């Protein structure tokens, strides 16, 4: 890879520069290079990896939705035939999004997940695995859609089992995992009652554990608890 000649520390240093410059494709490429050095990632380095690819795939998903909406309207009754261009370009963006997802899943499979023994690292990577299979599922329409959905579900479920046994209910990673697994239930698995039940139980069990936390930890946990509340308000 193009980053094979650059020191691991320099890749991490430049990933942070890219974030400051809002150059998230660069940031993701630097962090991919860092992962491919073969050493495990620190807490800070894991969050650099997730931030970079979250932003890249976030822009692709927003673009795919714009184009998908245009495509759907073009297939309504009374809509003028405009040729293959809308579908072609939606497919282009879709293929690039799928490529980003495959890249992340490849990093997790080779070999981040298998070397992650601590709960904080293992849960973090399994959440990521669930997230990027979810993003594949958002655009899936074929014969592998059900297996893609189950791959997201299975990764989320293993992460949930570990986090409930090994982390306190206010842990930001545990909270963000539960937030996203709830979103999976609502937006992917057609299970809104499961999504609502999970978000409520997660919020309540975190509320009851806030008294154990410092001011700084309290701020982190309540920030993510508010996202659970936002979704419950949106959904009810």
């Amino acid at each position: 890879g193009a980053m094979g000649s650059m020191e691991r520390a320099s890749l991490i240093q430049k990933a942070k520069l890219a974030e400051q410059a809002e150059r998230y494709e660069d940031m993701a490429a630097f962090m991919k290079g860092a992962v491919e050095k073969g050493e495990e990632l620190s807490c800070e380095e894991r969050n650099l990896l997730s931030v970079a690819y979250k932003n890249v795939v976030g822009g692709q998903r927003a673009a795919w939705r714009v184009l998908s909406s245009i495509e759907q309207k073009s297939n309504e009754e009374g809509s003028e035939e405009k040729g293959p261009e809308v579908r072609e370009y939606r497919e282009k963006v879709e293929t690039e999004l799928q490529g980003v997802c495959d890249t992340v899943l490849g990093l997790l499979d080779s070999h981040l997940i298998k070397e992650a023994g601590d709960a904080e690292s293992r849960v973090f990577y399994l959440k990521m695995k669930g997230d990027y299979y979810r993003y594949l599922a958002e655009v899936a329409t074929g014969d592998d859609k059900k297996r893609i959905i189950d791959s997201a579900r299975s990764a989320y479920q293993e992460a949930m089992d570990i986090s409930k046994k090994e982390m306190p209910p206010t842990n930001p990673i545990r909270l963000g995992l539960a937030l996203n697994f709830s979103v999976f239930h609502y937006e992917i698995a057609n299970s809104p009652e499961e999504a609502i039940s999970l978000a409520k139980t997660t919020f309540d069990e975190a509320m009851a554990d806030l008294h154990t936390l410092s001011e700084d930890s309290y701020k982190d946990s309540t920030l993510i608890m508010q996202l659970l509340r936002d979704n419950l308000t949106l959904w009810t």
Partner: peptide, 7 residues
């Protein structure tokens, strides 16, 4: 119906 928040 809108997109939900995620982490």
């Amino acid at each position: 119906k809108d997109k939900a928040k995620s982490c």
